[PDB]
C-alpha cells in the first residue's frame, strides 16, 4: 500500500496548481481518496468516496476541482486562484467497509 | 459549526500515561468514526486508533496493547487511553472524525504529547 503524491510547489497569488495521488498496492475494495492540508492546523479539503460521489471545503468550492482516473488509480486536485491562504503542506489521504487509514508524503505548496 | 476540543496532551517520563479526550460539538448529522493521527516533530502524519460508530475498534501495530480507543457516545466525546509511552511516541495527537452518508471530515486542534 504505497501512496505517490505529487504536483507541489511555489506559486505567485492567483496561480493554478494541479496535484496527484497516485496509488499502488491497494489490497482492498475502491477507496475512498480526500486531500488534507497542514497550514502553518489539518483541514479536509475535498474526497471523492469511490461510488463517484464528490465533496469540497466550502473555501475552495469552485476553484477546486476532484478527479480520479480509475485505470492508472490516480486522483487529481485541480487548484485555481491560489491565493495566500491555501499554503500549506498537502498530503493525500486513503480508506478502504474497511477503516484503514493512509497517507502520502506530503507534497508542499507555497503562494505569495 | 462542527468543532472538536483536544486535550489531555502533556509530558511523561519514558513509561508514563495520559488519556487524550477529543469532545465533538454542533450538528454531525450522521453516526461518526473517530480517528486519532499523530505527527512526529518534522515527520508526516500516522493513523494510530479508530472507533467505526457500530463500535468496531482498529490499532496501529505499534500501540495495541498500550493504547485503548473509547468513545461516549452520550457526550459525543472520543477518548485516546497511553499507557506505556514511549519516546516514540512522542509528537502531536489530532482526533478525525469523518461522518458521512457525505465524506465529511474534521479534525481537533492537536494536543502535544512529549516523552523523555
Known amino acids: 500500500?504505497?501512496?505517490?503524491?505529487?504536483?507541489?510547489?511555489?506559486?505567485?497569488?492567483?496561480?493554478?496548481?494541479?496535484?496527484?495521488?497516485?496509488?499502488?498496492?491497494?489490497?482492498?475494495?475502491?477507496?475512498?481518496?480526500?486531500?488534507?492540508?497542514?497550514?502553518?492546523?489539518?483541514?479536509?479539503?475535498?474526497?471523492?468516496?469511490?461510488?463517484?460521489?464528490?465533496?469540497?471545503?466550502?473555501?475552495?468550492?469552485?476553484?477546486?476541482?476532484?478527479?480520479?482516473?480509475?485505470?492508472?488509480?490516480?486522483?487529481?486536485?485541480?487548484?485555481?486562484?491560489?491565493?495566500?491562504?491555501?499554503?500549506?503542506?498537502?498530503?493525500?489521504?486513503?480508506?478502504?467497509?474497511?477503516?484503514?487509514?493512509?497517507?502520502?508524503?506530503?507534497?508542499?505548496?507555497?503562494?505569495? | 459549526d462542527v468543532q472538536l476540543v483536544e486535550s489531555g496532551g502533556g509530558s511523561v517520563q519514558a513509561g508514563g500515561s495520559l488519556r487524550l479526550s477529543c469532545a465533538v460539538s454542533?450538528?454531525?448529522?450522521?453516526?461518526?468514526?473517530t480517528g486519532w493521527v499523530r505527527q512526529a516533530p518534522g515527520k508526516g502524519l500516522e493513523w494510530v486508533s479508530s472507533?467505526?460508530?457500530?463500535?468496531?475498534?482498529y490499532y496501529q501495530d505499534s500501540v495495541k496493547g498500550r493504547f485503548t480507543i473509547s468513545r461516549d457516545n452520550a457526550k459525543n466525546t472520543v477518548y485516546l487511553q497511553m499507557n506505556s509511552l514511549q519516546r516514540e511516541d512522542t509528537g502531536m495527537y489530532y482526533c478525525?472524525?469523518?461522518?458521512?452518508?457525505?465524506?465529511?471530515?474534521?479534525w481537533g486542534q492537536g494536543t502535544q504529547v512529549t516523552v523523555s
Open positions: 478525525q472524525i469523518q461522518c458521512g452518508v457525505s465524506i465529511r471530515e474534521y
Open positions: 472507533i467505526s460508530s457500530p463500535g468496531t475498534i
Open positions: 454542533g450538528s454531525t448529522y450522521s453516526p461518526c468514526t
